[PDB]
């Protein structure tokens, strides 16, 4: 899975390392190769489950995967296992996915469909298609042979289930492309029939599937061999022609078609190809038709290291080599059929004479241009054009010709130019392109509107509107027009009568009845689409014309009889084009129309009289069923279902509301009985009566045309069909019809190239038919037997019986049916039930003895199915094998098979057994495995065997060939049958595996282990075995009380805690809690693997892992945990932060044993666990991992039951409330980061019962008076004070005050109870004591002074809390926190404030940590939303901080106060810079002046610029000048970027400072000046320089420093210190920026420097040049 976090030349290691892993797994006998197994199929699961496109990717894995199918390294000192391991895994992983599809009207399959029931499964599968592509496409010399025949058929068998799932076409090329690779399908032969099946099956199938599907389904049909398929090639030919077609775009699709056009040229011979070219060639003319960075830098070994599809135009190469190539015989075909059929049609005139003359208006001309010659072209570029934007182009010049050729018409006859522009638009409004469906979907639904108009109604172009959206219906291939259409006649339909008022819809072209008539037209016509469409049409107007009535009550039986009728005539053609769902789902809405309108509206007036009814003057829903009833047995299934479940429907449907039985009753006793045999057999003229038998009352017999056998099957069918629908149910009595035409056909089981296939399936759906009407005559009356004429049918029935059970392909069955031959079975076995318990079980036993016996499967099995030969015997073992399967699960192999026994079980099951256990001992192919798990499955459905079974498996026999053990391998092989038999016979089955457990140790555990990871698989479906496993393992402890103690060792107790956690994971819900009846068992062995000093703790770090099924106990058996663990835990600790240093493995195994501790923590909620955990977490000054603790503290105060946070926040408040001999340190820690973590980060809001259950204690212990007569007791009592303040304040922030300002809970506790005291009157106790503290007279205390501080800290934080929860709407903090009495020693800030240690505080956090810049800057922003200076806060921090008096520490502090919440004190920036720049500019900061105070300081007072500035007062303009001479005097600093950072806010500062004075001109001169001609030291300062001269600062000297002769030559003279490009450079451009100033300037001194800096320069122009 890592492999993809890897470097070239690095993931060669790797691969060489699992190899090499590889190789030793597989080096011993196999007992352990099945860890191969394991780890290449989990593999592949981690390789598909990423996501589908460092984030790692399947194409990352494709190198790695490829380097070991076949590329033996070898150096080291196998191939063949891993790939057939490989693809045994890829073919186990496509059984396993679940890719099942979830669903206005469509045709297209994946149009709302597509939508998969899982996502992830089906990325799961396009990543494995798309690995599976890079890795077995070569190779496949001879890896890939044995596999082919079995990975195809699954192939086909999943793919004829989804059809729609582009993938299985991609995999079943790939293999065919194996395939032709070697030689095969020569002249194995079941796999070629299979594939010819399935390949004719997808031809006929992929004409509706779209882009990817369809080229999918292409790339696996050209790829077919055929040179040997080569029958019928007209129907792969549409595969070939639409593979160019298609092509053009997808230049792989035109390569595929290539190379099969090449194959099929040069391969087959030219006599069977030559009548096949003039279709092909004619669709081939359209295919006539870094480094550069460095460039100009030699190619030097810089630029080494950076050198480290197909394309159309290979494709014309090819083409015209290929024309070329194919002779001047057959190349006139490419180009002779041109032009003649859509060619020559394009290059016709639209219309005959020009219209839509445009005149483009001018100045003065305004010429006449013809509109229309550009539309065949417009139209062309819209529809497809390649190219984004000339398609959008068109697409909007198209719409505006549209609407000026709508304006033209109504100022000239365009019916003709509409016929051509109406396709156009219904094509376009459908396609791909999202922009253009944008338009053209408004634009034709108001064309539809304009149209349906009366204004625009019954003329040409309306028709021709109508007209074309009607064969856009209907038309060749095109998935995504017809539902299109299908809205637009909708909304034809709706529009058509909402516009247009009855008083012109009786006689008027284009109306209701005229469409309807059109779609009942279009319905009876004899082609596939044509009626498809008109089916559709009604599917799209159902909702409408069914809330209208009138027509309802008109023509609804009409439209009943026309749709069944074309349901009847969609019987010919194929299921997959989806004609008859879209046909049946238009009956199905008719029929839920007509239940409502007609069970309480049934009447006999007049109505339409449908097609192939009798002239009648009144129609009713009576004779519609008489008629239905009369149609029952017709030729057609589809149509003969939805008639039978109509008639079914409508009998109840009567005004009688009879059931059908009566009714049936009451119509036969008047009728005759002899009505209703010729109904089942009538239908309409043609009879299984008439001719009243089989196939031999006809013109001529003996041979037969395919015509006769199929009527005659198909009418005997639903004669069948009709007869079991009719007896199975409850209607009429079996006596009642008791035809005769089923004698022959028990004779015609024993039977052109393709006709016989198709006379087996029309057989093979005729046989099944009879088996089951025998099935529901038999099981419905027992009584009617007698008239059963010797159904024995001469030992045929039976024979067709015994014949469909063992070997049923002589009958007629074939090898691809795959929907048939999983339905045998079924009915097979429903056959033989209902055949038991009626007086014929003697014969059916009788005949299937003859057939199968116990010899006979003796006979049959031989010592030979070790070898390669599997076609010939295996068959045979395969089907005898299936038929006893299938026979048993009939409920009856102990007649058939007689009970041949010894002492208890069957011979039979013993034999199979020691068979099956002989056979491997002296291959492990696929069919052979499978057919061995087959015959076991069969042995142990016989009997019993479960302890035979169990002392197979125990059996130390030892017999191996280089060393495994036998009866070992026996289960290592089969794991699957062996568990699933073992569990549905568990209550006897454990008792044997646990009575001898001793000595067979090793071998239990596996098979235990084995046995409860298949239970834990099987879980979600049966859900209650697991349960019975485990409490079954409970209730047997005792037997196995040898694994635990002073012996068994190591490798015994590891597998006794792993089979303890896998039962438990599927146990405790209902038992294990102290009641289970074997819990002190288990318990004792949990107790003694959790204790004393047996090894590692790394299985202790398992054990504990378990210790949440453990911590819901009660009564003392938490008192013993509790005791175990914290002797482990002080027997196994450190007692130390970082006692063992970091990397030693020692760490690693601390680390990992405290993350299992606080995993078994947070999992559940235990406060036992939570209070050690705190005890060895809160105790140390800085703990190694900090933040797990924390995350774990959060997970557990977000976990519901909020009975049990209160119980952890009780245990810890009473633990740290507890008064024991502490260093109180830990007493401080314990709520500093435990409690406090749980009570801030979440908590349940009925956490005030934890408030209510301290405040009649927390407010105690702060009244009480501190007793300073020792500090061991004093300190104790301090940090207690802190705890309580701390907790107090979270509750009071965290709850909002609608719980403490109302009498609920809290104020009960409080005092008295239910007195006045509605919010109040508590708060006021606690905050005078609060006020009290913080406010103490230090005076002259000296016992302590740190944890007084930090206590006054605490009582601050308080009261902010508790006034941040009280009302705050007015000022308040005049006496509370805020402006207290000096004059009695009340000092607030003064005591909280270290104010004694110097911070150093580099230039590049100490003081924002002080624990209570937070809570301060809360508060400030707080009131600030709860609203000149203000005098509460706003006057007296800024008298406190103006005041040079009052020492430093608190001055810094109340400047970060201000600079945190800028913001606040923005608008009120003028009484603020003073303080603020009098500390920026003062000598006494820390050290040499804290650059960091004073650049936060500075960058506040011009983040506020233009409120207010540093001048216009003499004291802060001084200050403000002593600040700038010291900022540059102290801007040098050895780093560029801090250095660089300096110089902008001095740059910034001389912006703001351009009001009132002064540059330290001495201190520049004295910084630039100096003789160096090897140092940078003029660098600073000819750059402040710059910085001067930058906006408009003059060199101003006429009176500063030295006079300018001297300033201004210093100046000049650095140009001559050539040693570094920047001094000189930014010399010479500030001398420039200087002479244009005093230049731009009138002042006579320009020529003095001028001539200075020319002598400079000729001083330079002869020695060096470039300087």
Avoid at 271 to 294: E, F, W
Avoid at 812 to 839: R, T, W, Y
Avoid at 1135 to 1152: K, L, W
Avoid at 1313 to 1325: R, V
Wanted: one cysteine or more; charged letters at 20%; proline letters at 4%.
């Amino acid at each position: 899975d890592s492999f993809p976090q890897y470097s070239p030349k690095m993931q060669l290691v790797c691969c060489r390392a699992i190899v090499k892993v590889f190789l030793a797994l597989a080096a011993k006998g196999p007992v352990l190769r099945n860890c191969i197994s394991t780890v290449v199929h989990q593999g592949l699961i981690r390789i598909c489950s990423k996501p589908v496109v460092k984030v790692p990717t399947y194409k990352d894995y494709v190198d790695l995967f490829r380097h070991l199918l076949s590329s033996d390294q070898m150096m080291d000192s196998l191939n063949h296992l891993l790939y057939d391991e490989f693809v045994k895994s890829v073919l186990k992983i496509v059984e396993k996915l679940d890719l099942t599809l979830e669903i206005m009207i469509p045709t297209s399959d994946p149009a709302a469909n597509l939508h998969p029931a899982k996502p992830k499964d089906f990325s799961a599968f396009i990543n494995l298609v798309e690995f599976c592509r890079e890795i077995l496409p070569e190779k496949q010399a001879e890896f890939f042979e044995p596999w082919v025949y079995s990975f195809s058929y699954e192939l086909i068998l999943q793919s004829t289930r989804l059809p729609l799932i582009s993938g299985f076409y991609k995999l079943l090329s790939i293999t065919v492309r194996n395939a032709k690779k070697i030689k095969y399908f020569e002249g194995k032969y079941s796999c070629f029939a299979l594939f010819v099946k399935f390949g004719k099956e997808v031809a006929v199938k992929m004409k509706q599937y779209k882009d990817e599907l369809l080229a999918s389904c292409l790339t696996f049909l050209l790829s077919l061999p055929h040179n040997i398929i080569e029958l019928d090639v007209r129907a792969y030919v549409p595969a070939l022609q639409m593979a160019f077609k298609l092509g053009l775009s997808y230049t792989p699709l035109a390569e595929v078609g290539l190379n099969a056009l090449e194959e099929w040229s040069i391969y087959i011979d030219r006599h069977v190809m030559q009548p096949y070219y003039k279709d092909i060639l004619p669709c081939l003319d359209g295919y006539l038709k870094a480094l550069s960075r460095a460039a100009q830098k030699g190619f030097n070994k810089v630029v080494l290291k950076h050198l480290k599809a197909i394309s159309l135009e290979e494709i014309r190469i090819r083409v015209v080599q290929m024309l070329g190539s194919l002779g001047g015989q057959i190349n006139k075909n490419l180009l002779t059929v041109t032009s003649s059929d859509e060619m020559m049609k394009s290059y016709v005139a639209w219309d005959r004479e020009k219209r839509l003359s445009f005149a483009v208006p001018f100045r003065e001309m305004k010429p006449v241009i013809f509109l229309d010659v550009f539309l065949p072209r417009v139209t062309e570029l819209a529809l497809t054009a390649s190219d984004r934007q000339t398609k959008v182009a068109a697409c909007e010049l198209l719409h505006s010709m549209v609407m000026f050729m709508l304006g033209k018409a109504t100022q000239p006859p365009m019916y003709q130019l509409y016929k051509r522009t109406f396709p156009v638009l219904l094509r376009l409004a459908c396609d791909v392109d999202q922009v253009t469906r944008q338009l053209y979907e408004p634009l034709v639904m108001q064309l539809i509107h304009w149209f349906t108009n009366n204004k625009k109604f019954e003329s040409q172009d309306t028709v021709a509107l109508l007209e074309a959206i009607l064969d856009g219906i209907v038309d060749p291939v095109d998935s995504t027009l017809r539902d299109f259409c299908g809205r637009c006649i909708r909304e034809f339909l709706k529009w058509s009568i909402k516009q247009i008022t009855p008083q012109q819809q009786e006689k008027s072209p284009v109306n209701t009845k005229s469409l309807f008539k059109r779609l009942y037209s279009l319905a009876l016509h004899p082609n596939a689409f044509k009626r498809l469409g008109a089916s559709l049409a009604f599917n799209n107007i159902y909702r409408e014309f069914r809330e209208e009535e009138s027509l309802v009550e008109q023509f609804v039986f009409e439209a009943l009889v026309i749709y069944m009728e074309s349901l009847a005539l969609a019987h010919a053609d194929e299921k997959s084009l989806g004609t008859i769902q879209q046909c049946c789902d238009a009956i199905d809405h008719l029929c839920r129309i007509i239940e409502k309108k007609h069970v309480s509206l049934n009447k006999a007036k007049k109505r339409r009289l449908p097609r192939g009814f009798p002239p009648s003057a009144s129609l009713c829903l009576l004779d519609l069923v008489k008629w239905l009833l009369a149609h029952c047995g017709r030729p057609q299934t589809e149509c003969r279902h939805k008639s039978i479940e109509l008639f079914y429907k409508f009998v109840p449907l009567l005004p009688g509301n009879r059931s059908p039985n009566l009714w049936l009753k009451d119509v036969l006793k008047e009728e005759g009985v002899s009505f209703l045999i010729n109904t089942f057999e009538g239908g309409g003229c043609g009879q299984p009566s008439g001719i009243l038998a089989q196939p031999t009352l006809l013109y001529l017999r003996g041979p037969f045309s395919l015509q006769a056998t199929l009527c005659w099957l198909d009418l005997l069918l639903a004669a069948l069909e009709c007869y079991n629908t009719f007896i199975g149910e409850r209607t009429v009595g079996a006596l009642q019809v008791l035809l005769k035409a089923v004698a022959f056909f028990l004779e015609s089981i024993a039977m052109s190239p393709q006709e016989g296939e198709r006379y087996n399936y029309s057989k093979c759906t005729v046989v099944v038919r009879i088996m089951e009407f025998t099935t529901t005559l038999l099981n419905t009356s027992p009584e009617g037997w007698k008239l059963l004429k010797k159904d024995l049918c001469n030992t045929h029935l039976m024979r067709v019986l015994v014949q469909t059970l063992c070997e049923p392909a002589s009958i007629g069955f074939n090898i691809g049916d795959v929907q048939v031959m999983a339905h045998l079975p079924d009915v097979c076995v429903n056959l033989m039930k209902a055949l038991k318990m009626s007086p014929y079980k003697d014969i059916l036993e009788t005949h299937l003895r003859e057939k199968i016996t116990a010899q006979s499967i003796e006979e049959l099995c031989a010592v030979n199915l070790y070898g390669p030969d599997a076609q010939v015997d295996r068959s045979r073992l395969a089907a005898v094998v299936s038929a006893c399967k299938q026979l048993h699960r009939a409920g009856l192999l102990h007649n058939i098979l007689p009970s041949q026994s010894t002492d208890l079980h069957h011979s039979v099951g013993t034999e199979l057994l020691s068979l099956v256990y002989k056979g491997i001992a002296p291959s492990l192919d696929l069919s052979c495995k499978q057919l061995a798990s087959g015959l076991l499955e069969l042995a142990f459905a016989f009997g019993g065997l479960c302890e035979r079974l169990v002392s197979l498996l125990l059996n130390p026999a030892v017999l191996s060939t280089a060393h495994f053990s036998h009866g070992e391998y026996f289960y290592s092989l089969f794991s699957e049958t062996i568990n699933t038999e073992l569990l549905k016979n568990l209550d006897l089955a454990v008792l044997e595996l646990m009575q001898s457990s001793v000595d067979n140790t090793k071998m239990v555990s596996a098979v235990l282990n084995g046995m409860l990871d298949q239970s834990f698989r099987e879980r979600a479906n049966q859900k209650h075995q697991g349960l019975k496993l485990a409490t079954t393992i409970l209730q047997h402890w005792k037997k196995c009380d040898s694994w635990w103690a002073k012996d068994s060792p190591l490798e015994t107790k590891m597998a006794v805690l792993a089979l303890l956690a896998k039962i438990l994971q599927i146990d405790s819900s209902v038992s294990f809690n102290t009641s289970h009846g074997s819990f002190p068992e288990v318990f004792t062995t949990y107790i003694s693997l959790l204790a004393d000093t047996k090894l590692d703790l790394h299985l202790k770090g398992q054990a504990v892992t378990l210790l949440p099924f453990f911590t819901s106990l009660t009564g003392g058996s938490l008192e013993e945990l509790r005791r175990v663990l914290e002797q482990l835990i002080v027997a196994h600790f450190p007692m130390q932060s970082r006692e063992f240093p970091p990397g030693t493995p020692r760490f690693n195994n601390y680390v990992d044993c405290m993350k299992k501790f606080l995993d078994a923590l947070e999992l559940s909620q235990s406060p036992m666990l939570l209070e050690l955990m705190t005890e060895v977490l809160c105790r140390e000054q800085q703990h190694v991992m900090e933040e797990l603790f924390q995350s774990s503290f959060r997970r557990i105060a977000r976990r519901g039951s909020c009975v049990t946070q209160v119980g952890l926040l009780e245990s810890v408040y009473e633990m740290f409330r507890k008064d024991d001999p502490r260093l109180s340190f830990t007493r401080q820690s314990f709520v500093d980061r435990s409690l406090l973590t749980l009570l801030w980060h979440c908590s349940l809001d009925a956490l005030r019962e934890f408030f209510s259950t301290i405040v009649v204690d927390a407010i105690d212990v702060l009244k009480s008076r501190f007793t300073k007569l020792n500090e061991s007791t004093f300190d104790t009592q301090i940090t207690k004070k802190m705890g309580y303040y701390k907790i107090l304040d979270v509750m009071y922030s965290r709850l909002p005050k609608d719980d403490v300002h109302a009498k609920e809970s809290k104020i009960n506790q409080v005092f008295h109870g239910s007195c006045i005291t509605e919010g109040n009157e508590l708060t006021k106790t606690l905050i005078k004591l609060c006020y009290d503290a913080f406010t103490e007279n230090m005076a002259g205390e000296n016992q302590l002074l740190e944890r007084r501080r930090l206590y006054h800290c605490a009582a601050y934080n308080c009261a902010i809390s508790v006034i941040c929860c009280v009302f705050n709407e007015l000022k308040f903090y005049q006496g509370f926190l805020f402006s207290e009495k000096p004059e009695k020693n009340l000092l607030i800030f003064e005591n909280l404030i270290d104010l004694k240690r110097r911070y150093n505080f580099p230039v590049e956090d100490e003081l924002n940590r002080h624990e209570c810049m937070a809570p301060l800057t809360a508060l400030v922003k707080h009131m600030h939303r709860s609203l000149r200076d203000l005098p509460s806060w706003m006057k007296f921090l800024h008298g406190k901080l103006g005041n040079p008096i009052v020492p430093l520490n608190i001055r810094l502090f109340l400047a970060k106060l201000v600079i945190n919440t800028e913001e606040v004190f923005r608008p009120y920036a003028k009484h603020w810079l003073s303080p603020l720049l009098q500390l920026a500019a003062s000598e006494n900061n820390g050290g040499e002046g804290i650059h960091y105070m004073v650049v936060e300081i500075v960058a506040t007072i011009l983040s506020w610029t233009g409120l207010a500035t540093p001048t216009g007062v003499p004291k802060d303009e001084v200050l403000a000048n002593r600040l700038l001479n010291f900022l540059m005097k102290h801007v040098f600093h050895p780093k560029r970027a801090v250095f660089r950072h300096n110089l902008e806010i001095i740059k910034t500062l001389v912006e703001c400072w351009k009001d009132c004075l002064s540059i330290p001109y001495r201190l520049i001169f004295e910084k630039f000046s100096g003789k160096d001609p090897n140092s940078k030291d003029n660098s600073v300062g000819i750059q402040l320089l710059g910085i001067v001269m930058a906006n408009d600062l003059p060199p101003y000297d006429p009176q500063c420093g030295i006079q300018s002769s001297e300033y201004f030559q210093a100046l000049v003279n650095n140009m001559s210190f050539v040693r570094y490009k920047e001094v000189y450079a930014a010399a010479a451009e500030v001398l420039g920026l200087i002479l244009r100033y005093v230049m731009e300037r009138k002042n006579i001194l320009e020529e003095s420097l001028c001539e200075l800096v020319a002598k400079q320069l000729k001083q330079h122009q002869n020695t060096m040049e470039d300087k």
